[PDB]
């Protein structure tokens with residue numbers, strides 16, 4: 001069966017790990033715990049096709065570190081994550097997208113824009129700003145909450161669909 005290497009990028013604290021832990025381990029915990037189980041693999045069925053998801057979480061890596069460069073060049077698709085209550089994380093998306101484009105030497109890389117923490121009443125980045133940005137990039141935009149599980153599976157499955165359209 002086909003294996004998809006999905007890379008999760010974005011500023012520290014946007015919820016890249018919480019999104020991964022929900023998808024793979026079925027839970028959310030607010031407290032940071034680095035001793036949690038190291039599973040990043042899940043067998044799943046998307047649009048009838050059975051596949052294996054391998055999630056490469058860039059959290060905890062220094063920017064420009066070797067492991068981060070390795071994750072990016074082996075990754076087939078990218079989730080570009082910002083938090084809806086973190087303006088700077090949204091402004092940083094352009095930087096993460098340009099970096100993926102450089103490391104892949106491609107102007108057409110499968111990507112999904114993810115607006116995380118959509119359970120928060122606290123909102124400094126509007127849906128329209130994110131929809132206009134994803135439209136200019138020609139990529140899907142998905143609103144998620146790693147806390148309530150809203151849009152989580154949709155964001156990773158939409159990325160797999162983007163990889164398939166590309167191939």
Ligand SMILES: *CCC(=O)N(CCC(=O)Nc1ccnc(-n2ccnc2C)c1Br)c1ccnc(-n2ccnc2C)c1Br
Pocket residue numbers: 012013016017018020021032033034036037038039057058059060061
């Ligand atoms: C800038 C903040 C952090 O990056 N960070 C570390 C977060 C981290 O490494 N998370 C992470 C990376 C890769 N895999 C997993 N993971 C385990 C199981 N499944 C997955 C997806 C995870 Br959980 C961070 C966050 C919060 N606090 C701290 N911290 C503790 C003490 N001092 C500091 C700043 C850190 Br370093």
Ligand SMILES: Nc1nc2c(ncn2[C@@H]2O[C@H](COP(=O)(O)OP(=O)(O)O)[C@@H](O)[C@H]2O)c(=O)[nH]1
Pocket residue numbers: 010011012013014015016017018019029030031032059060116117118119120144145146147148
């Ligand atoms: N309210 C809320 N908090 C979240 C959500 N996702 C992550 N967080 C919290 O935001 C903090 C940072 O998340 P983390 O997954 O470690 O971010 P990362 O650095 O991008 O991997 C933690 O306290 C999480 O519990 C979410 O959807 N909603």
